[PDB]
């Protein structure tokens, strides 16, 4: 998250709501966020195989 | 510890070959026989591991056994045994409804024991 500054070299921690909820530890995790933005993954188990 | 009881002995040591006496007793006997009269009555024992459920079957208080396993059988076992429970288990007291010998009731039970001989 870049913010206006004379030097513009901030590289500060973003203030996203879900990101803050994940990092603080209130609710959620990385494995639950990655299924909302990126790909859920394999996620397949009808039997003892993939 | 709750599952490290029911050991077996090899030597008689003024005691019969019961092969399964409780470790507690397997020590108390010695503590009463070795230093008092003669140490040669000491019998070596081997602490054998017993199943977490099987150890429950070693509960002498049948009143606190029927609620843990099949009742009828145990009942008959006591009958052919004609044994007594003497209400030495917490559950037992609960079935009777008095104060348990633990917690705030511990002291109470202590007093009860003080009422055994002295009164």
């Amino acid at each position: 998250t870049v913010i206006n500054r004379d030097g513009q070299e901030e590289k500060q921690v973003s203030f996203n709501s879900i990101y803050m909820m994940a990092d603080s530890g209130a609710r959620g995790s990385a494995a639950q966020i990655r299924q909302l933005a990126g790909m859920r993954g394999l996620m397949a188990k009808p039997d003892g195989s993939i | 510890r709750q599952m490290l009881r029911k050991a077996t002995i090899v030597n008689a040591g003024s005691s019969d070959f019961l092969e399964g006496e409780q470790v507690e007793y397997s020590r108390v006997k010695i503590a009463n026989r070795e230093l008092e009269a003669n140490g040669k009555v000491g019998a070596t024992y081997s602490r054998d591991l017993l199943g977490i459920t099987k150890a429950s079957l070693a509960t002498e208080s049948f009143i606190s056994a029927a609620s843990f396993q099949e009742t009828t059988r145990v009942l008959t076992e006591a009958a052919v045994a004609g044994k007594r429970d003497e209400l030495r288990g917490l559950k037992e007291n609960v079935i009777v409804g008095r104060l348990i010998p633990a917690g705030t009731g511990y002291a109470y039970h202590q007093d009860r024991m003080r009422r055994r001989a002295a009164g």
Partner: protein, 138 residues
């Protein structure tokens, strides 16, 4: 359920060794919580010979734990309840407290319930289920 604290003093100096477990790749549990609510053995040894830190009848209030964390001790024997007993109940010093209280365990507390209840409390575990050796540091 049939466990009730009926004895105050253990009477024996026996015990079991307590060392931090290691799996090679990383340390799973340091020697700070395995000895936290524990009473030390008959004598503890320092890296320097002819030295003692705590006697056999002192409980660790995390201060001697922080002290041992500075001395880098590794071999500490801990008195347990399975190795030492009075043929009935559980001795006090030989069990520590490790409960919601900061003092030592008192006579009469149901150890046999808190134990075998804290074991079955986590009822949400799960259901129905090379040649060369590298080093991490020096």
């Amino acid at each position: 359920q049939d466990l009730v604290v009926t004895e105050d003093d253990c009477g024996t100096h026996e015990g079991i060794m307590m060392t931090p477990v290691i799996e090679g790749g990383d340390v799973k549990e340091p020697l700070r919580d395995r000895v936290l609510g524990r009473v030390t053995a008959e004598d503890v040894l320092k890296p320097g010979t002819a030295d003692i830190l705590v006697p056999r009848n002192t409980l660790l209030h995390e201060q001697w734990c922080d002290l041992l964390e500075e001395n880098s001790v590794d071999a500490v024997k801990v008195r347990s309840v399975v190795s030492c007993d009075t043929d009935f109940g559980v001795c006090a010093h030989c069990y520590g407290r490790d409960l919601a209280r900061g003092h030592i365990i008192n006579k009469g507390e149901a150890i046999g319930v808190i134990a075998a209840q804290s074991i079955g409390e986590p009822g949400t575990q799960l259901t129905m289920r090379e040649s060369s050796i590298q080093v991490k540091n020096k």
